[PDB]
RNA sequence: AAGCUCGUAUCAGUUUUAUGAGGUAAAGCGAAUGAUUAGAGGUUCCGGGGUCGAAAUGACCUUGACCUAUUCUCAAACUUUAAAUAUGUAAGAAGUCCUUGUUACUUAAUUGAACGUGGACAUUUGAAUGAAGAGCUUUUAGUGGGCCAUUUUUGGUAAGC
RNA sequence: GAGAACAGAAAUCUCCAGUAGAACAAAAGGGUAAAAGCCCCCUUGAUUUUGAUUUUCAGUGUGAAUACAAACCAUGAAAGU
RNA sequence: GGUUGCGGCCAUAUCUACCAGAAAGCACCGUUUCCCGUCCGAUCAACUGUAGUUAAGCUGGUAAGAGCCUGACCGAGUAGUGUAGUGGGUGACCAUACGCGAAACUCAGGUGCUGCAAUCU
């Protein structure tokens, strides 16, 4: 960095470093404060969040609570579990967002017992609706959307995640105006469009058009679809049946594993440089003042 | 090394500093509009100067930022006017370059007495791939040294493709 | 219109600087604090001799200036203007007030009147560096300066090399080694700490061992 | 002033015994300019109690003079005679608190052959009388008893 | 003339601690208070709502109420020759659990144990604390350690 | 002053132990802000003079500022550090543990929260020292010019101010 | 700081550095960085009822403030505020 | 052990300059029909995971590195301070007695620890 820049001792000395997880630009503490702190007269009642994050093409849903030692996963689902349920391609799209939320809701709601009561909407017509509490009986499991750093846009797929955890039985408080098919100039949802997205209707109709206007591109992206003979129109049943498969058995299978922890550990240290000792450092200095000093 | 630490153009920002609002500015605008295909953005004066005859918040200038192929169709076009000779300044320490021209007529575009004649400031900013790191929301970070755009890197880049001259010392 | 200095000998008040709360305060009568061959190198003048307060009191800017001129005048005419380096070690930062004067003791907060340095026991007031051969001249210069000051001060022979913090033999150890290198009129010492690379830049005549 | 009260020294020349722990050291420290103290020998604890030793009994300061007086109020702790009492004192026994509190503060006279110094109110170490004079307390207290 | 507003004289009190400004860490909000708890009071200057008055800085009281974002603390304050009861509405940012009590709770829980460990065995306990006692005798050896004789040193100047 | 309700009981212008609060003294200034003495080495397409000049975004001196590492000196309304004295709370029966009742609060939830029932452990039951006991109620006098000494300390040259 | 016609010490355009050296009506102190600052979007909680509390204190009043209860609303995807 | 998502303490985590990083992950990265946002699909939105890459991010190692953290009879029982005297001294001030006791300095050692969950030669 430029000479006239470059930090003075005093700059560095007084520098107050942010929280690590801010330096990492990973955590909005302002939102977290407000996501996590509980009503003080509700004592040790955990305040569970529904964490939805998007990697370059994996979807992560964890149900999380907080502890001063660290946060706590109740459950976790990933859209890369969806091949197990009959979804192979496009697992980062709106409907993979939906699926996973559904997967996450069903899974936890199971291991909590609220499984057979609170099924949530089994139909799915993209009707706007929260899961209502069963008269005489346990209140539903309540959970708050942790969007993270995601911008709120009307159509964002983080809210796709939200739709399916709510469709799946969770009580996740929310309004309707960030779902595709929310009309800008009228406080009005078109659920016909929102049904469409849940079942990847936009992806499908995008294939149908690329079919007969430009097959150059249609085979680049959408390659996989060709390769498995899934020409569009079936995309709904694909996801319609995922929903089925998921509710039928959400109970989370781990990867088999192959090679042990000890073993993954063994090979990883092969690639991990090791710090030097003081002695070792001393003999590099000494070494240097024989060369750079002793007139070569 | 060298795989995809290539040297794209980040964006081209054309700028007209018309120290006044009113008609003359809305003509300076029209130029950039038809020239960029995009609708230009106006800029208010930052404070009053009075010997420049401007007031705070007046609207004093128009400018427009252009990316991708469209930015080259124009760069080239201006570079022509400059007869493919810039100067050893012009290029900034952090790897950008700019030049100016007067009379935009010298890059296609007829005369039209009802629009007049304007000069332009061309400013080309360079970067490589992976520049997103700086610009994105999450895990915003800074490009590593040996991936930063530098003067040498940009001048040599310029000297090659375009096959234009640098000049001076 | 100066009050006699007896009215401000003692440190009766918390320090009253020139500040943005004060502001209208007169200049210090002392204003140059380094006379003689100040440009001189450290190796040039090894003998240091101090004029050293034996009292907790206040010295006026006026008496610093008068004392300044006294020691400097004597010194240069007996032994030459480049024969020595006089350093005044004490700056008059403390503003003295005056209740100048119908109304009595009503609203009595005074106006700035002049300045004083506040000075400890054993606090150094004047420092000089010369050639050993010139000791007596220097010592007589500080002796004559004394009569310009209230209170007891007493002249003390330094252990140190000029304005250095090292005793003469220790400064000699570092010097006749590599370690010491000239600067303006002071000196820079080689550190065992920090970048080895640009430690070698400076102090080239080190990184041997010998002469 | 408070400390002198708690140590039961509320008039000049009266004295009491003190078990030394950190928590009484610091008491002693706070009153060094008003007191003279030291380490008493068997001889002077014995002659203190034989001569100027008084029980506290339903208040009422009662002279020791017969062993039944002691056994009636300290018997509960073992301690059924005057030399039992002394023994609890000098060895700082398990019942030094009850034993020692039993003893009314000793009322002493002025030193008979005097203070040995021109001025009492500086430390023993500066040719005064106050503070810890260690074993030199026995000479003082005998002269006072 | 004089001035005596609420936060008067509090420049350094409510000030923030060197290189510790900004968001308060989330542990301050995860802590949990129950009526009866003993708390110390100290103002977070960056949290203007729910602040103790400066009189209560450094002061320790007992929780009497738990509220959505706060706890009610009762402090005993002495005015004239008497104490009066004071009740404070403090946000959880200006409060922490006092450890003025652990040495007790830790000591109780322990005191029960060695009492069980005694009884069950056949008594002989002794579990009151005791002050520092004076030192017992001891024999210090000279071997490897003959005494070094020092004397006072002459006057000297260095300067 | 009148008492009144009780009494080994509860009490304390004190210590100890444990656990807080504080920004004064000192200190610091080759640490931030603000002051302040001196050189040394840098940097100008760019503050001014001057030599060469047709000029130069020319070259060379020149003096300024600015930068780098040093240097002497300071703060009631400066400060990273930071005392001593003083200061909040705790040292048990109104305690600790087990069992599991009440509610309209609260929980996804007989979950929690608060108040409880039943059960277990006595004076080394939880530091020191002291305790002509402790608590409590009514009513009413005089007073509401104060002054002095050690220490801290403001204004003032100072004062038996 | 380094860069771009007219354009200059000061106009407008760009990149780098930047712990706050700014800004937040106002005195000054405290506070504040994906904010408490700047730009935009929606708004009237600057509302309704009546208590408790902190400072000043007599533990009166007044000013100002705090944390709840019972309404009705605002905003936000939401926790919330 | 690596890595990711969510974290706690918030520099032993920061800063400057170099170099090394398997596997997975993360990333950069391709696209503009659709929701959505822009002067600009750079950011923001969506779509593909296909076409490309470890260059950067990220992680780690190096440095008589700047900073930060820890320790010591390093400085210093120094400065300051509670208590004492019909102590010294014209005074300014200063010794002593019984206690409490720093900061700078100097030197040495260090440079993130760790919770939940998923994944990986
Ligand atoms: Mg700088
Ligand atoms: Mg430095
Ligand atoms: Mg910050
Ligand atoms: Mg937010
Ligand atoms: Mg590559
Ligand atoms: Mg004009
Ligand atoms: Mg004084
Ligand atoms: Mg005064
Ligand atoms: Mg007058
Ligand atoms: Mg008159
Ligand atoms: Mg007046
Ligand atoms: Mg005035
Ligand atoms: Mg004199
Ligand atoms: Mg006793
Ligand atoms: Mg006799
Ligand atoms: Mg005789
Ligand atoms: Mg006689
Ligand atoms: Mg006498
Ligand atoms: Mg006698
Ligand atoms: Mg005032
Ligand atoms: Mg407010
Ligand atoms: Mg103060
Ligand atoms: Mg101060
Ligand atoms: Mg001071
Ligand atoms: Mg000082
Ligand atoms: Mg300091
Ligand atoms: Mg300074
Ligand atoms: Mg020095
Ligand atoms: Mg106390
Ligand atoms: Mg007390
Ligand atoms: Mg008793
Ligand atoms: Mg009694
Ligand atoms: Mg009365
Ligand atoms: Mg009265
Ligand atoms: Mg009256
Ligand atoms: Mg009267
Ligand atoms: Mg007196
Ligand atoms: Mg302000
Ligand atoms: Mg934020
Ligand atoms: Mg109003
Ligand atoms: Mg009234
Ligand atoms: Mg009021
Ligand atoms: Mg790979
Ligand atoms: Mg479009
Ligand atoms: Mg893109
Ligand atoms: Mg996006
Ligand atoms: Mg690499
Ligand atoms: Mg990352
Ligand atoms: Mg270092
Ligand atoms: Mg003292
Ligand atoms: Mg005296």
A10 CB inside 7 Å of strand F = yes
Q: Is the dihedral of CA A195, A198, A202, A207 positive or negative?
A: negative
For residue E134, give the DSSP letter.
P
C194 CB burial (10 A radius; 0-12, 13-18, 19+): exposed
| Pairwise CA distance, residues D54 & D66, whole Å | 11
Residue appearing with tokens 């002493």: D108
Q: What tokens does B15 get?
A: 């700028």
Q: Report the 10 Å Cβ neighbour count for A143.
A: 25
DSSP per residue over D31-91, as a string?
TTTT-EE----HHHHHHHHHHH-EE-SSSS-EE--SHHHHHHHHTBTB--SHHHHHHHHHT
Note whether D111 and D90 are within 8 A (CB).
no
Cα distances (Å, whole numbers) of residue A227 to A83, A221, A223, B137, D6: 16, 12, 6, 36, 98
CA distance C70 to A63: 85
Chain A residues inside the 8 Å CB shell of B138? 25-26, 148-149
Q: To which H or E segment does residue D133 belong? A: none
Is the backbone of residue A7 left (phi > 0), alpha (psi -120 to 50) or beta? beta
Asked if B62 and B43 touch (Cβ cutoff 8 Å), the reply is yes
Distance, in Å, from the CA atom of B94 to the CA atom of B127, rounded to the nearest integer, reads 10
B144 to chain A nearest CA, in Å?
A: 11
* N-to-C CA span, chain D: 25
Closest CA to B32 of B12, B5, B48, B49: B12
Three-class secondary structure assignment of B58-98: CCCEEEEEECCHHHHHHHHHHHHHCCCECCCCCECCCCCEE
- Please say whether the beta carbons of D106 and D53 come within 8 A: yes
A31 has a chain E CB within 8 A of its CB: no
Judge if the beta carbon of E109 is closer than 7 A to nucleic acid strand F: yes
Please give the structure tokens belonging to residue B116.
């007049």
Nearest of A223, A246, A238 to residue A61 by alpha carbon:
A246
β-bridge partners, E40: E60, E96
Task: Report resolution (Å) to 1 decimal.
Answer: 2.8
Give the Cα separation of A148 and A53 in Å (integer): 7
D16 secondary structure, DSSP code: -
Beta strand ranges found along chain B (DSSP E): 9-16, 41-43, 61-66, 97-101, 120-126
Question: Which three-class secondary structure state does DSSP give residue D117?
Answer: coil
Breaks in chain C (C–N beyond 2.5 Å) sit after: 101
CB C83, CB C130: distance < 8 Å: yes
Cβ A109 vs Cβ A61: under 8 Å: no
CA of A47: nearest nucleotide by C1' is G79
**D46 CB-contact burial (10 Å; exposed 0-12 / middle 13-18 / buried 19+):** middle
Strand, coil or helix: E90: strand
Which technique was used to obtain these atomic coordinates?
Answer: X-ray
DSSP state of C180: E
> Residues 57-96, chain A: which have Cβ within 8 Å of E?
66-68
Q: What are phi and psi of B98, to 5 degrees?
A: -150, 160
Distance of CA D26 from the midpoint of ligand 29 (Å): 13
Whole-number Cα distances in Å, A130 to A77, A119, A183, A244: 21, 12, 20, 20
A58 has which bridge partners? A55
Residues of chain B in contact with residue A24, where contact means CB-CB under 8 angstroms, are 139
Three-state secondary structure along A168-209? CCCECCCCCCCCCCEECCCCEECHHHHHHHHCCHHHHHHHHH
Instruction: For strand H, give the nucleotides within 7 A of a protein CB.
Output: 1-2, 4-11, 13-23, 25-31, 33-37, 39-68, 82-87, 91-94, 96-99, 107, 109-121
Q: Name residues whose C-beta falls within 8 Å of residue A277's C-beta, 6 or more positions apart in sequence.
A: none
C57 touches C151 (CB < 8 A)? yes
Is residue A146 within 8 Å of residue A49, measured between CB atoms?
yes
User: What's the rounded Cα separation, in Å, for the pair B90 and C74?
Assistant: 64
Residues of E with CB under 8 A from a CB of D: 130-134
Environment class of residue A76 by beta-carbon count within 10 Å: exposed (0-12), middle (13-18) or buried (19+)? middle
* D20 interfacial to chain E (CB closer than 8 Å): yes
Interface test with D, best of E124, E128, E132 (most D CBs within 10 A): E132
Give me the helices (H) in chain C, please: 61-79, 135-146, 168-176, 197-200
Contact between chain A and chain D (3 or more Cβ pairs less than 8 Å apart): no
């Amino acid at each position: 960095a430029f000479q006239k820049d470059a930090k003075s001792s005093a700059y560095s000395s007084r520098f107050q470093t942010p929280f690590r997880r801010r330096r990492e630009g990973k955590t909005d503490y302002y939102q977290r404060k407000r996501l996590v702190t509980q009503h003080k007269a509700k004592y040790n009642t955990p305040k569970y969040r529904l964490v939805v994050r998007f990697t370059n093409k994996d979807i992560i849903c964890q149900i999380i609570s907080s502890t001063i030692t660290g946060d706590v996963v109740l459950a976790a689902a990933y859209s890369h579990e969806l091949p197990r349920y009959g979804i192979t391609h496009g697992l980062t799209n709106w409907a993979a967002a939906y699926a996973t939320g559904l997967l996450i809701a069903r899974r936890t709601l199971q291991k909590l017992g609220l499984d057979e009561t609170y099924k949530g909407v089994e139909e799915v017509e993209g009707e706007y609706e929260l899961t209502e509490a069963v008269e005489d009986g346990p209140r539903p499991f309540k959970v708050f959307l942790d969007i993270g750093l995601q911008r709120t846009t009307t159509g964002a797929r983080v809210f796709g995640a939200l739709k399916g955890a709510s469709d799946g039985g969770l009580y996740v408080p929310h309004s309707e105006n960030r779902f595709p098919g929310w009309d800008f100039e009228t406080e009005e949802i078109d659920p016909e469009l929102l049904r469409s997205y849940i079942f990847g209707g936009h992806v499908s109709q995008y294939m149908e058009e690329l079919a007969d206007d430009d097959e150059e591109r249609f085979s680049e992206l959408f390659k996989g679809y060709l390769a498995d003979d899934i020409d569009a129109d079936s995309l709904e049943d694909i996801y319609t049946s995922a929903h089925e498969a998921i509710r039928a058995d959400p109970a989370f299978k781990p990867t088999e594993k192959k090679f042990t922890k000890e073993q993954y550990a063994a090979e990883s240290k092969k690639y991990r440089q090791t710090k030097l000792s003081k002695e070792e450092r001393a003999a590099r200095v000494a070494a240097k003042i024989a060369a750079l000093a002793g007139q070569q | 090394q060298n795989p995809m630490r290539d040297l794209k153009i980040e964006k081209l920002v054309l700028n007209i500093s018309v120290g006044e609002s009113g008609d003359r500015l809305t003509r300076a605008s029209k130029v950039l509009e038809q020239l960029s295909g995009q609708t230009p953005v106006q800029s208010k004066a930052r404070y009053t100067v009075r010997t420049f005859g401007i007031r705070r918040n007046e609207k004093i200038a128009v400018h427009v930022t252009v990316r991708g192929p469209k930015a080259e169709e124009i760069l080239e076009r201006g570079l022509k006017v400059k007869e493919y000779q810039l100067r050893d300044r012009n290029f900034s320490a952090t790897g950008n370059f700019g030049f100016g021209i007067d009379e935009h007529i010298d890059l296609g575009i007829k005369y039209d007495p009802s629009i007049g004649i304007f000069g332009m400031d061309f400013y080309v900013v360079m970067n490589r791939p992976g520049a997103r790191v700086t610009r994105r929301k999450r895990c915003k970070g800074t490009v590593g040294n040996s991936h930063k755009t530098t003067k040498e890197d940009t001048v040599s880049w310029f000297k090659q493709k375009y096959d234009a001259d640098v000049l001076d010392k | 219109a100066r009050r006699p200095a007896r009215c401000y000998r003692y440190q009766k008040n918390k320090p009253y600087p020139k500040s943005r709360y004060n502001r209208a305060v007169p200049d210090s009568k002392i204003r140059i604090y380094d006379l003689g061959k100040k440009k001189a190198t450290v190796d040039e003048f090894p003998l240091c001799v101090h004029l050293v307060s034996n009292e907790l009191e206040q010295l006026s800017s006026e008496a610093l200036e008068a004392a300044r001129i006294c020691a400097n005048k004597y010194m240069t005419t007996v032994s030459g203007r480049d024969a020595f380096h006089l350093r005044v070690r004490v700056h008059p930062f403390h503003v003295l007030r005056i209740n100048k004067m119908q109304q009595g003791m009503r609203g009595a907060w005074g106006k700035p009147h002049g300045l004083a340095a506040r000075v400890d026991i054993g606090q150094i007031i004047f420092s000089v560096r010369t050639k050993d051969s010139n000791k007596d001249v220097v010592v007589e210069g500080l002796r004559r300066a004394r009569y310009k000051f209230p209170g007891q001060q007493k002249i003390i022979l330094s252990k140190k090399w000029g304005f250095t913090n090292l005793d003469r033999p220790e400064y000699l150890k570092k010097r006749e080694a590599g370690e010491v290198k000239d600067d303006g009129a002071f000196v820079k010492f080689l550190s065992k700490k920090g970048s080895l690379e640009n430690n070698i830049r400076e102090f080239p005549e080190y990184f041997a061992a010998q002469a | 002033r408070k400390v002198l009260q708690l140590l039961r020294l509320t008039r000049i020349n009266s004295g009491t015994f003190v078990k030394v722990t950190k928590a009484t050291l610091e008491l002693l420290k706070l009153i060094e300019p008003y007191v003279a103290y030291g380490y008493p020998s068997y001889s002077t604890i014995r002659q203190l109690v034989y001569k100027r030793g008084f029980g506290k009994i339903n208040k009422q300061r009662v002279p020791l003079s017969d062993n039944a007086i002691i056994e009636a109020n300290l018997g509960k702790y073992g301690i059924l005679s005057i030399d039992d009492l002394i023994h609890e004192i000098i060895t700082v026994g398990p019942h030094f608190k009850q034993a020692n509190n039993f003893l009314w503060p000793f009322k002493l006279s002025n030193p008979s052959g005097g203070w040995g110094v021109p001025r009492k109110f500086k430390h023993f170490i500066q040719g005064g009388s106050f503070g810890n004079r260690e074993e030199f307390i026995n000479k003082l207290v005998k002269s006072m008893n | 003339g004089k001035s005596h507003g609420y936060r008067s004289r509090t420049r350094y009190m409510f000030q923030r601690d060197f290189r510790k400004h900004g968001a308060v860490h989330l542990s301050t909000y995860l802590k949990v208070y129950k009526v009866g708890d003993i708390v110390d009071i100290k103002a977070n200057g960056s949290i203007q709502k729910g602040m103790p008055h400066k009189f209560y800085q450094g002061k320790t009281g007992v929780v009497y109420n738990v509220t959505k974002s706060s706890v009610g603390v009762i402090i005993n304050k002495m005015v004239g020759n008497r104490y009066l009861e004071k009740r404070l509405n403090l946000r959880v940012e200006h409060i922490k659990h006092s450890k003025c009590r652990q040495e007790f709770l830790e000591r109780v829980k322990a005191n029960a144990a060695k009492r069980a460990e005694a009884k069950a065995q056949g008594v002989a306990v002794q579990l009151k604390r005791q002050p520092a006692q004076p030192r017992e005798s001891r024999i210090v050896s000279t071997e490897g350690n003959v005494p070094q004789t020092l004397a006072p040193v002459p006057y000297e100047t260095f300067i």
